[PDB]
Amino acid sequence: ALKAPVVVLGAGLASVSFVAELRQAGYQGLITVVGDEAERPYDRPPLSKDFMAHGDAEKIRLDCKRAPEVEWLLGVTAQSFDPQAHTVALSDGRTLPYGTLVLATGAAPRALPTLQGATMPVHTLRTLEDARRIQAGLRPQSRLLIVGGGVIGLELAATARTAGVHVSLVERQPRLMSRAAPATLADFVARYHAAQGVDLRFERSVTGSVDGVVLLDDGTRIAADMVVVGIGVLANDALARAAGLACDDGIFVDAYGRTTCPDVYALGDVTRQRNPLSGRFERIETWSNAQNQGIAVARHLVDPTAPGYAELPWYWSDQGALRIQVAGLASGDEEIVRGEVSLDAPKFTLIELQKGRIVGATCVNNARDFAPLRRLLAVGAKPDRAALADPATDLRKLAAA
Amino acid sequence: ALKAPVVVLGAGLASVSFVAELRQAGYQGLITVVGDEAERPYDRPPLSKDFMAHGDAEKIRLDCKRAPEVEWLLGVTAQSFDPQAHTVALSDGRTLPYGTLVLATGAAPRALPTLQGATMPVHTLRTLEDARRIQAGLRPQSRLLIVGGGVIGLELAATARTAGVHVSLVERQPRLMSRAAPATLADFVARYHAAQGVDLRFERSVTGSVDGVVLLDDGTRIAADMVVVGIGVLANDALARAAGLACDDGIFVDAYGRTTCPDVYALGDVTRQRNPLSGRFERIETWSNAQNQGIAVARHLVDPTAPGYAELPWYWSDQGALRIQVAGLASGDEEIVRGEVSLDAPKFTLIELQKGRIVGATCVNNARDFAPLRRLLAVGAKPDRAALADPATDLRKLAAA
Numbered sequence A, B: 001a002l003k004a005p006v007v008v009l010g011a012g013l014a015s016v017s018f019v020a021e022l023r024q025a026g027y028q029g030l031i032t033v034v035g036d037e038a039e040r041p042y043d044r045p046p047l048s049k050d051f052m053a054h055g056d057a058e059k060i061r062l063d064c065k066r067a068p069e070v071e072w073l074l075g076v077t078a079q080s081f082d083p084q085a086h087t088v089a090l091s092d093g094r095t096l097p098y099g100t101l102v103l104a105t106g107a108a109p110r111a112l113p114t115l116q117g118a119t120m121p122v123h124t125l126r127t128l129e130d131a132r133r134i135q136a137g138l139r140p141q142s143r144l145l146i147v148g149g150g151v152i153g154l155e156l157a158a159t160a161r162t163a164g165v166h167v168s169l170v171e172r173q174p175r176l177m178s179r180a181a182p183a184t185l186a187d188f189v190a191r192y193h194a195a196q197g198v199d200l201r202f203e204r205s206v207t208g209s210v211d212g213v214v215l216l217d218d219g220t221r222i223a224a225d226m227v228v229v230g231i232g233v234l235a236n237d238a239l240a241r242a243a244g245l246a247c248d249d250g251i252f253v254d255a256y257g258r259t260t261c262p263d264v265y266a267l268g269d270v271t272r273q274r275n276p277l278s279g280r281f282e283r284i285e286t287w288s289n290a291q292n293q294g295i296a297v298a299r300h301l302v303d304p305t306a307p308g309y310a311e312l313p314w315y316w317s318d319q320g321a322l323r324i325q326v327a328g329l330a331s332g333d334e335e336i337v338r339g340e341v342s343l344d345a346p347k348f349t350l351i352e353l354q355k356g357r358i359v360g361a362t363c364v365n366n367a368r369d370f371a372p373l374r375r376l377l378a379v380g381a382k383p384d385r386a387a388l389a390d391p392a393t394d395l396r397k398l399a400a401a
């Protein structure tokens, strides 16, 4: 079942969470983690916010305290694994044996093919190294072009604007945050960023670039000092594909984290997995999934009577004045709006229903309502829609029933 | 690896092919097959053609000669399996032990929700029982409505027209065969069926029905004596889902037929698997996949040095005067047309290319060209596009190089 020794590939949040849970659950056998970045394991969300702005990496490290007696092979790349021999080949020339192999290799940013041969700075934002490079190439009154209106681009937009950087943003879709956000939220978010001076360009794609100017598909030009591309990520599933595991931009796993290869597990951003709400497989890229799927897989490995991973997806995104929280599905057959949707001290809550049942929720600058909404979502609650809209209703009270 | 005893769930083409290959490859341990239909195992394509027209089921049975010493439990439903206990629970009250479990349970037709409460005959066409019922409810000059312009509906359309049945066909898409057919082929096929008297209704959906009349979304009505619904199939993956395997309208498998559950394999229509051409996972519903994936999985189970399943997808469809064969992707960046596309003695070949490389092909009434085109497709050939178009070119010769 859980067979020693355990080897984990990747040393991000998912991996750290997994190995800390193994220890906490009582596994005392060998754990070796292989991490290609030569960095003390660290959390990524500050890279678009407080780290980007203030630059102290020692405030963003992950705590490995709950993972004692782990050897972390930092700055080392796993090059292949042989699932028959039960071995992993490392870039430093060593080989690791394993009883259980855990793939927690995450995802890497998609490149924009039309900027491949560019002769101006073009960066993506995923690592400490990326953050440091983008940080050092921006100055107040510089001109930053962001490609992609996802949460990373928008988080960077906010931070750049606060620093006095002029920001343009090109998005292929008619709206921002098309991945996992209610249209009502996306529209408001566009309203917010436009008011903070972001120059938004919708339904535009980059067709190429020439000597410091980016070219768009509507025949026009944008001049920038730097391009940051944030058009999503792609699973780091190369080792899995080579070794014969089922993959498709992500390693297919069940609720136990099992791949199609015996004794090989996967978790976090690298996985394609079931979303219990939609009942479909999806590659979930959220911080909460990385942590929670990692814990769930570990728990069940040590104690096979534990249930499989069962959490419903949620995320937050901090974008300047907007502290955004989103849980569940972006849409249902009904949206209930609690509060006013206003740039004047923004504060509101959205609730998505499907046939009377809560299937998703959004809070903007309203954390207190988000926890109880997540509880209602989990148990498939069907509150009175009238009470859901009524400002006088205590969602915390409601949730407690 | 291959651990006795072997239990297979489902007794269709995929299952028969799998168990015959196990025997041929040298496995001599127990094989028990559980098949819910109380029928000698049989092939389905004649159900829309020669069986529908002539009604002799003894011409459509699968040969189990190459699968000696197999117990076929016909008319028995597997209700669950316990992958820990390594047992399968049967509807007759018995339990089967297994060393290796193989899920070959196929797929069932999708129902049309707007006809659920209908009070006129509404059938789907998948089994011998379906065929017999549709057969007995049609008469010459009866009015048949077919919902769905896939190969099954079109095959039935042809057979019904030949029998003197009036046929209407409603399709949601602007074209027929939207699943896996080049647009050039689909357009011609519509031309053919219209000329044979089929009343085609595109971009229409059924909204319901009232007392022998079907209602459409454009506010209109179609009167028919019988509706046959052919809007695709859904994987029979219930046992897999309950048992904790990764599934999403189909059981995820790698090229060895492995699911995410140790000692459980799956093959045929029930599987979601990698299409090597598109590099994406797909549920492939072709006869050739059922047979060939079943053989490939068996071969590798007996002999683990054998390669995994590697075939590229292809199918045929016999529709009246049109003997259609299609291999690979429906489209690339270029289509080459060999011959004239004409209702006057139809005979032509399409070739789809992607950056010089053959990625798909179609033959209509030209079997001799289809085999060599499949060989060129397999090795990713890049023939001179000029020679591909030139009528004087021998594709068989070309393929032999």
Ligand SMILES: Cc1cc2nc3c(=O)[nH]c(=O)nc-3n(C[C@H](O)[C@H](O)[C@H](O)COP(=O)(O)OP(=O)(O)OC[C@H]3O[C@@H](n4cnc5c(N)ncnc54)[C@H](O)[C@@H]3O)c2cc1C
Binding pocket: A009, A010, A011, A012, A013, A014, A015, A034, A035, A036, A037, A043, A044, A045, A046, A047, A048, A076, A077, A078, A079, A104, A105, A106, A107, A125, A126, A127, A151, A152, A155, A236, A239, A267, A268, A269, A270, A285, A286, A287, A288, A290, A314, A315, A316, A317, A318
């Ligand atoms: C700029 C930024 C802002 C973010 N803000 C938010 C946010 O507002 N909200 C939110 O929910 N999430 C946010 N995220 C955080 C995010 O969701 C987590 O970082 C992520 O989900 C963690 O997943 P992971 O541990 O599986 O993968 P990763 O963090 O990618 O870790 C995988 C590691 O494995 C390494 N690796 C890959 N292949 C190999 C190999 N062969 N050998 C060794 N190592 C290998 C990778 O390089 C990587 O270091 C943000 C991320 C970024 C980059």
Ligand SMILES: Cc1cc2nc3c(=O)[nH]c(=O)nc-3n(C[C@H](O)[C@H](O)[C@H](O)COP(=O)(O)OP(=O)(O)OC[C@H]3O[C@@H](n4cnc5c(N)ncnc54)[C@H](O)[C@@H]3O)c2cc1C
Binding pocket: B009, B010, B011, B012, B013, B014, B015, B034, B035, B036, B037, B043, B044, B045, B046, B047, B048, B076, B077, B078, B079, B104, B105, B106, B107, B125, B126, B127, B151, B152, B155, B236, B239, B267, B268, B269, B270, B285, B286, B287, B288, B290, B314, B315, B316, B317, B318
């Ligand atoms: C009308 C018709 C026309 C066709 N014509 C074409 C064609 O022109 N071209 C083409 O390429 N293909 C055609 N097909 C044939 C087709 O592609 C094959 O029949 C199919 O791919 C076989 O897949 P299978 O063996 O995996 O599944 P199936 O044939 O569905 O066999 C699975 C069996 O398992 C049974 N089962 C499911 N659950 C359980 C359980 N819990 N316990 C026991 N048994 C269970 C099912 O009832 C079924 O009998 C046609 C099919 C039909 C119905």
Ligand SMILES: NC(=O)C1=CN([C@@H]2O[C@H](COP(=O)(O)OP(=O)(O)OC[C@H]3O[C@@H](n4cnc5c(N)ncnc54)[C@H](OP(=O)(O)O)[C@@H]3O)[C@@H](O)[C@H]2O)C=CC1
Binding pocket: A110, A147, A148, A149, A150, A151, A152, A153, A171, A172, A173, A177, A178, A179, A180, A205, A230, A231, A232, A233, A283, A284, A285, A286, A287, A313, A315
């Ligand atoms: N469910 C989840 O997994 C969610 C994850 N997050 C976060 O998302 C982050 C990563 O994604 P991010 O970088 O922000 O970008 P996104 O994945 O959000 O994508 C942003 C936009 O880029 C567009 N795009 C994608 N591909 C291309 C392309 N080839 N050319 C031009 N445009 C393209 C997309 O449009 P289009 O749709 O047309 O391709 C999309 O509108 C992760 O860090 C994660 O934390 C946030 C919410 C939910």
Ligand SMILES: NC(=O)C1=CN([C@@H]2O[C@H](COP(=O)(O)OP(=O)(O)OC[C@H]3O[C@@H](n4cnc5c(N)ncnc54)[C@H](OP(=O)(O)O)[C@@H]3O)[C@@H](O)[C@H]2O)C=CC1
Binding pocket: B110, B147, B148, B149, B150, B151, B152, B153, B171, B172, B173, B177, B178, B179, B180, B205, B230, B231, B232, B233, B283, B284, B285, B286, B287, B313, B315
């Ligand atoms: N690659 C493969 O797997 C292929 C399999 N085949 C054969 O396909 C057969 C089964 O499919 P078949 O029954 O013919 O139908 P199809 O899967 O071909 O679908 C036919 C049409 O039905 C429409 N449709 C689907 N769902 C609905 C719905 N809920 N309401 C209204 N219309 C809908 C589809 O449109 P829409 O797209 O909008 O949903 C589609 O255009 C199998 O027997 C197999 O042999 C043939 C070629 C390739």
